[PDB]
Amino acid sequence: RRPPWDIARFRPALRVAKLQAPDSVQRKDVRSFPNFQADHFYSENRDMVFVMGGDSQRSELRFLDEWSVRTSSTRRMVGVLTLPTPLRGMKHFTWMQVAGGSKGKKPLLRLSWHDKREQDLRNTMLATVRLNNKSGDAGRFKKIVLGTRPSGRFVADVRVERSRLTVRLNGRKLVDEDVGYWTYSTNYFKAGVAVQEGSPDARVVFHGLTVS
Ligand SMILES: O=C(O)[C@H]1O[C@@H](O[C@H]2[C@H](O)[C@H](O)[C@H](O[C@H]3[C@H](O)[C@H](O)[C@H](O[C@H]4[C@H](O)[C@H](O)[C@H](O[C@H]5[C@H](O)[C@H](O)[C@H](O)O[C@@H]5C(=O)O)O[C@@H]4C(=O)O)O[C@@H]3C(=O)O)O[C@@H]2C(=O)O)[C@@H](O)[C@@H](O)[C@@H]1O
């Protein structure tokens, strides 16, 4: 295992993100990558690997650029990645998002993996598009099934511009939504592993990741 920063094709994305993980694992969000590796963030097989367990706990890049949905310049994140079979006890983790930041509060989008959902689906991937930024019973969502977890790599490609949000998975446009009601100006991408519910370690393996 070696520092991810050793793999040059990860450097452009590393230069415009910081790595968030729990307070127990890191004093400060990581901003300097050369030489850095830990159990939660390392490179094996030339890939950049995030590993975290515990509900709410994350090992996730937080991209520093912040924008509104109305933006004329595309914001886009594309990842080539593998979700290895999760361990029994791992229920729900998020491997890409559009975070709503300080004004939005809640994520506009989460791309997540789930042991079980009903919409009876097992081992299934979800895009959740928030219809408002509200908590608990008051929140409204569009939940878009993304299908079964690929057993090997796949490509996820998230875009927003001019109030349109899309997500392509291996080229197929599975999410295509007007997000103009989401007026907040503090959105930004993240990628990695953020565990919603699960005690065992989840691991998310990136073969490439670029933002633009
Ligand atoms: O299945 C279900 O149970 C339901 O899921 C519902 O989606 C929920 C999720 O399950 C998660 O609870 C999700 O949690 C969000 C949380 O609501 C915030 O939006 C949070 O935002 C954190 C940011 O990502 C970022 O880390 C930010 O960093 C600050 C921080 O102060 C930090 O210390 C650092 O130093 O500096 C930064 C910064 O850089 O700005 O903190 C934000 C924070 O509030 O802590 O992100 C989590 C997350 O994991 O994404 O919320 C969603 C949701 O939509 O509410 C929903 O799908 C529902 O249908 C299901 O039934």
Numbering used by the authors: 27 to 145, 149 to 241
What's the paper's own text on this?
In heterotrophic bacteria that use alginates as crucial nutrients, alginate lyases depolymerize alginate into alginate oligosaccharides (AOSs) and then into monomers for assimilation into the central metabolism. The overall structures of these PL7 alginate lyases are similar, showing a β-jelly roll fold composed of two antiparallel β-sheets with a deep cleft. The noteworthy structural differences among the solved PL7 structures are the loops around the deep cleft, which are variable in length and sequence and involved in alginate substrate binding with the deep cleft. Structural study on several PL7 alginate lyases reveals that two loops around the substrate binding cleft determine product distribution.
In addition, it was reported that the PL7 alginate lyase PyAly also shows substrate specificity for polyM. For the product generated by PyAly, the trisaccharide content was approximately 21.9% whereas the tetrasaccharide content was 44.8%, making tetrasaccharides the main product. The structures of the PyAlyH125A-M8 complex and the PyAlyH125A_Y223A-M5 complex were solved at 1.62 Å and 1.70 Å, respectively. In contrast, the structure of the PyAlyH125A_Y223A-M5 complex presented the complete M5 substrate at subsites −2, −1, +1, +2, and +3. Through structure alignment between the PyAlyH125A-M8 complex and the PyAlyH125A_Y223A-M5 complex, the overall sugar binding profile from subsites -3 to +3 is presented in Fig. 2e. +1 subsite: The side chain of Arg84 formed two hydrogen bonds with the C-5 carboxyl group, and the side chain of Gln123 formed one hydrogen bond with the C-5 carboxyl group. +2 subsite: The side chain of Gln46 formed one hydrogen bond with the hydroxyl group at the C-2 position. +3 subsite: The side chain of Arg88 formed two hydrogen bonds with the C-5 carboxyl group, and the side chain of Lys44 formed one hydrogen bond with the C-5 carboxyl group. Notably, residues Q (from the first conserved region) and R (from the second conserved region) formed interactions with the C-5 carboxyl groups at subsites +1, +2, and +3, respectively, based on the structure of PyAlyH125A_Y223A-M5 complex. Interestingly, although the bound oligomeric substrates for PyAly and A1-II’ had different chemical structures, their three-dimensional orientations were similar.
